[PDB]
Write a protein that binds this ligand. Structure first.
Ligand code: CLA
Ligand code: CLA
Ligand code: CLA
Ligand code: CLA
Ligand code: CLA
Ligand code: CLA
Ligand code: CLA
Ligand code: CLA
Ligand code: CLA
Ligand code: BCR
Lengths: 160, 169, 125, 165, 153
């Protein structure tokens, strides 16, 4: 496989470690499904750190019983022990459905990153590849940005 | 068996004592698998003696024993100084490799494993002996060299009684 | 009369894959495998709860006794192969019972090896 | 259904109710569905033994582990795992590793019924019409329904133990 | 058809298909039911009081000690609302939309429509969805009231 949505321009078929010399045709889609899912999580993850930094923490109470003004929970690592395990369980449940929804089993329409969002469905103006490639490329950038951001929040100690 | 992946210019087809004069293609397959596997173990073993003489891993081997990687003796004395639970877990792990991933399929190539890559890199490829005839020979000769060396290093430790400068003059 | 424990799929494949029955094994390989198993196992009953179980060595005695048991059963196997002479392991056109005798000799060798390996593990660890 | 007919009449609250309220089986092939069942039965069979092992250990019966540690281990099975000597755990892993090796490579189950690890399919009938027998489908229900209950049961034990004691 | 109403048309300045509308319809009716349950559910801890009582888990003889519109918690009934959450899932995994052949039909277990009073299609199917839409806005508006404008009433 050398002609999918991943080959943008600055690098060609970038497989230095040779996962494609033996990458089966379904393995590409499986790994592509992994890449699309990873990239979309990273975009949500990145927003989830840069947005509470500039925009203040949620005006609210997070847990109506355990006094969480969103300000005692820091933006970054360590918030895992600050957010309640149930608010952690409830986001785990919500993400649990989002895959136990319309299936992403091998060969299913959910297995190539298609789920039915269609926020940006341009009327096929030679832009379906543009939006697809942009999502993949941004997800690749978001994953790299997050890992640096995670190391930023860890090695320094807090936030950035 | 000249032309099999193991013939090299220094000796051609060595067979001095004539241990494979008759065909016995089954015998050659078994002995080749042993030659590759013993070479790979020897190659990993040969690096296992050199590196501790320069570098030691940072942490503790058995944190609930005080034992840290530094104070374990090198060579054939760690067997009686590394706790038996430690060595038993290596045996269990090598058992996993020999029974699970690194299980030589009969139909596959002599040293081919169905889960490892071109030099052994975990996560793999099916072998292509004709194209890779250079590296397959390189592995055997390096394994052949390592088997001589590791038999040396263990012998050096057995006589000199250490792993320091005297063990390797 | 087919039963689960002898004629089930697992039972059939387990019996067929034993060293005595495994396809493609040279007789010396079957002997070596069986002997290694026997020699490794036989050390335990002597080095523990033996006459010298509490002595400082307490294991070389077990090693000697296990090697003796392996030798005795190997002698019995040689008697069996020189009297009954099973011919199921002989290759075509060979002295009858030669395969069985080779299997028994390599069982003796494997018993020595397994006993020594068990003793080495006990002493080292 | 077509392909889910190979695992038909074997799940749901009532025996002939294909539950699947996530579409995990539709569009999947016959071998994949059979492999999914092989995962289900293997999880459930271990879960049944896991629950039994949990209860015979949470009541005060940990002989091998009281006689190896030379002290009565704690009744809490999670905490008793830590106290159990490392030699015992490694041998426990190795024994299961040998069993898992034994079933897979030397004595493989068939490819049409990949859960027949004992291999009854070579002596079983499963397609006769007798009443005082041929209830093998019913005993398949009891294995699956009990095992499914054991799967959620053992997770409840572990989750509650690791959280609310 | 169905939920098309009277004061507005298809009200789609954004689905607009068949299969996608069917899934959206299932979401619409589902959200409608909860709001109607929640809206009338919120008015009841008000007049008629916090009706509950009897021996409950860590809440024996609890007179619905979960106060306010949000309910708070503090081991008062709201922890028992998790049991409502769990048993809500049981009906959501047994009588669900995967075997729900029409939009949001659960085969009418109560048989209320078997001439008991509701009818099939026509106004009743349109009245259910329209009432659900009103309650969903009402429940959300009630959420704003409890948050920063006192309590319900
Ligand atoms: C979850 C991560 C992930 C996965 C599954 C994929 C998967 C894929 N990528 Mg991809 N990619 C990623 C991340 C990932 N990518 C990131 C972060 C970048 C930005 C550098 C890219 C940039 C990129 C380009 C430019 C192209 C692809 C392409 C592809 C496809 C074929 C190549 C292949 O087999 O890659 C398999 C990938 C893996 C097996 C990932 C292994 C990662 C290793 C184990 C670690 C790498 C080092 C890591 C950064 C260390 C982190 C440090 C940490 C420990 C502290 C395949 C679908 C090509 C394509 O679409 O061809 C049609 C293509 O042209 N990708
Ligand atoms: C383009 C993305 C990006 C950006 C803007 C930054 C930005 C920064 N990094 Mg950084 N970093 C990144 C990705 C990124 N990082 C990645 C992917 C890694 C892992 C390979 C790191 C690993 C890293 C380390 C180890 C350190 C930084 C440090 C820094 C700071 C100097 C600065 C805020 C320094 C810092 O502030 O400490 C965390 C520092 O010492 N970076
Ligand atoms: C574990 C021990 C072991 C085993 C089983 C083998 C097995 C084999 N070697 Mg070998 N070899 C070994 C160690 C071993 N080697 C070591 C340590 C050296 C270095 C001295 C060599 C050097 C060597 C050469 C130079 C050649 C072999 C060859 C062979 C093959 C035929 C000869 C034979 O039966 O040898 C018993 C056979 C596959 C021959 C070959 O590859 O034939 C195709 C050949 O030419 N070997
Ligand atoms: C009375 C006890 C007894 C008997 C009947 C045998 C019998 C035998 N031994 Mg033996 N052996 C014994 C004790 C015994 N062993 C002990 C105590 C030791 C330890 C020193 C050995 C060490 C030993 C070796 C090292 C070898 C034998 C071998 C043999 C076989 C010739 C024969 C089956 C040989 C063999 O198995 O070759 C086929 C052989 O090489 N034995
Ligand atoms: C894997 C092979 C192996 C290894 C590493 C050892 C290692 C050792 N043996 Mg040993 N041994 C072996 C095979 C082996 N043996 C075999 C096959 C036999 C049967 C002939 C013996 C018979 C044997 C005796 C009789 C004695 C040892 C002793 C010893 C120790 C000196 C040392 C731990 C000695 C020892 O320390 O005993 C306490 C000792 O007395 N071994
Ligand atoms: C290892 C777990 C496992 C697996 C692989 C299967 C596999 C199967 N089940 Mg099954 N089941 C299980 C556990 C499992 N079951 C448990 C615990 C229960 C009790 C509620 C049931 C109850 C059940 C019924 C009632 C029916 C099946 C049926 C089936 C078959 C259809 C495929 C299917 O439903 O999805 C296969 C794929 C999965 C089950 C994926 C596993 C679940 C994913 C990973 C998400 C779950 C994560 C979870 C929310 C969080 C974990 C903690 C949790 C305990 C809270 C298939 C053979 C149907 C059948 O064959 O009938 C003819 C059927 O009617 N199952
Ligand atoms: C999922 C299956 C499973 C697993 C992973 C374990 C795992 C474990 N068990 Mg266990 N156990 C199980 C099922 C299981 N058990 C069942 C079904 C029973 C009822 C017979 C027991 C009864 C049991 C006892 C009485 C003890 C353990 C103990 C232990 C621990 C040490 C290993 C050991 O001695 O086991 C030994 C297991 C047996 C002797 C049971 C054999 C029955 C098998 C499963 C029939 C097939 C280990 C964490 C020991 C401990 O200290 O616990 C912390 C201990 O003393 N188990
Ligand atoms: C769960 C919410 C939900 C869902 C899924 C639907 C679904 C549907 N409605 Mg519906 N509706 C709802 C709530 C909902 N409704 C409410 C609360 C009202 C009252 C105002 C209405 C009033 C209404 C009318 C009057 C009509 C429909 C119609 C329809 C159908 C086609 C319309 C369409 O494509 O919209 C697609 C819309 C979206 C994809 C956007 C979803 C809503 C976004 C996410 C937020 C909207 C703004 C919101 C107020 C801000 C929330 C803030 C919050 C984050 C704090 C479709 C089945 C039409 C119909 O019958 O067609 C046959 C029709 O005529 N609806
Ligand atoms: C969206 C649906 C929904 C949800 C999430 C809840 C959830 C809750 N209700 Mg509620 N309720 C509902 C529908 C709902 N109910 C309906 C339809 C009615 C009308 C019969 C009521 C009538 C009701 C009363 C009278 C009270 C609650 C109360 C409560 C809380 C404690 C549990 C309890 O006693 O419930 C009781 C639930 C029922 C009797 C419904 C059947 C809990 C957070 C109590 C509370 O703590 O006040 C907030 C309380 O006093 N509810
Ligand atoms: C209890 C149990 C059981 C059983 C088990 C068994 C039966 C076991 C056995 C085991 C065994 C029985 C093991 C053994 C092993 C052995 C070994 C491991 C050996 C080795 C050896 C060696 C290695 C040797 C070598 C050598 C030789 C060969 C010769 C020369 C010298 C030398 C030394 C080199 C069952 C399942 C029923 C159930 C429950 C549990």
């Amino acid at each position: 496989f050398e002609s999918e949505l991943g080959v943008q321009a600055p690098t060609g078929f970038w497989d230095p470690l040779g996962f494609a010399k033996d990458g089966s045709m379904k393995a590409f889609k499986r790994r592509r499904a992994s890449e699309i899912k990873h990239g979309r999580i990273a975009m949500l993850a990145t927003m989830g750190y840069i947005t509470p930094e500039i925009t203040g923490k949620f005006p609210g109470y997070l847990s109506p019983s355990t006094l969480l003004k969103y300000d005692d929970i820091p933006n970054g690592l360590g918030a895992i022990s600050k957010v309640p395990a149930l608010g952690w369980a409830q986001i785990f449940v919500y993400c649990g459905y989002a895959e136990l929804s319309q299936d992403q089993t091998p060969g299913s329409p959910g297995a190539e990153g298609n789920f039915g969002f269609k926020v940006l469905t341009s009327s096929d103006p030679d832009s379906l590849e543009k939006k697809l490639a942009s999502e993949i490329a941004n997800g690749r950038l978001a994953m790299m940005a997050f890992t640096g951001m995670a190391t930023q929040d860890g090695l320094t100690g807090s936030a950035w | 068996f000249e032309g099999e992946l193991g013939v090299t210019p220094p000796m051609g087809y060595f067979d001095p004592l004539g241990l494979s004069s008759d065909g016995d293609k089954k015998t050659f397959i078994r002995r080749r698998k042993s030659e590759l596997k013993n070479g790979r173990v020897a190659m990993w073993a040969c690096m296992g003696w050199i590196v501790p003489e320069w570098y030691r891993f940072p942490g503790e081997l058995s944190p609930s024993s005080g034992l840290k990687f530094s104070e374990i003796p090198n060579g054939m004395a760690a067997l009686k100084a590394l706790p038996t639970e430690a060595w038993a877990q290596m045996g269990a792990f090598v058992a996993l490799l020999e029974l699970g991933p690194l299980w030589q399929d009969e139909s596959r190539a002599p040293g081919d494993f169905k889960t490892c890559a071109k030099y052994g890199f975990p996560m793999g490829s099916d072998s292509d002996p004709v194209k890779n005839q250079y590296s397959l020979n390189s592995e055997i000769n390096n394994g052949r060299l390592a088997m001589m060396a590791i038999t040396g290093m263990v012998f050096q430790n057995g006589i000199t009684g250490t792993t320091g400068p005297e063990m390797w003059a | 009369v087919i039963t689960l424990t002898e004629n089930g799929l697992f039972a059939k494949q387990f019996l067929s894959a034993l060293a005595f029955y495994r396809e493609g094994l040279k007789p010396w390989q079957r002997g070596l495998e069986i002997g290694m198993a026997h020699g490794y196992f036989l050390i335990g009953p002597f080095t523990s709860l033996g006459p010298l179980r509490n002595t400082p060595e307490a294991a070389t005695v077990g090693l000697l006794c296990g090697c003796a048991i392996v030798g005795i059963v190997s002698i019995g196997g040689l008697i069996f192969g020189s009297t009954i002479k099973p011919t199921r392991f002989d290759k075509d056109g060979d002295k009858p019972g030669a395969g069985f005798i080779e299997m028994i000799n390599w069982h003796a060798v494997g018993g020595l090896g397994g006993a020594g390996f068990a003793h080495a593990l006990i002493t080292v660890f | 259904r077509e392909a889910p007919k190979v695992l038909a009449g074997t799940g749901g609250p009532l025996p002939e109710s294909f539950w699947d309220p996530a579409g995990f089986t539709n569009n999947k092939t016959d071998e994949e569905l059979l492999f999914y069942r092989a995962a289900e039965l293997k999880h459930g069979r271990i879960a049944m033994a896991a629950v039994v092992g949990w209860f015979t250990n949470a009541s005060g019966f940990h002989y091998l582990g009281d006689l190896w540690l030379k002290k009565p281990a704690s009744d809490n099975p999670i905490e008793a795992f830590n106290q159990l000597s490392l030699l015992g755990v490694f041998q426990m892993v190795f024994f299961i590793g040998c069993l898992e090796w034994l079933t897979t490579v030397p004595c493989p189950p068939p490819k049409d019924a990949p859960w027949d690890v004992i291999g009854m399919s070579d002596v079983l009938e499963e397609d006769t019409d007798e009443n005082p027998m041929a209830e093998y489908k019913k005993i398949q229900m009891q294995e699956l329904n009990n095992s499914r209950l054991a799967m959620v049961a053992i997770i409840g034990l572990i989750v509650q133990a690791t959280t609310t004691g």
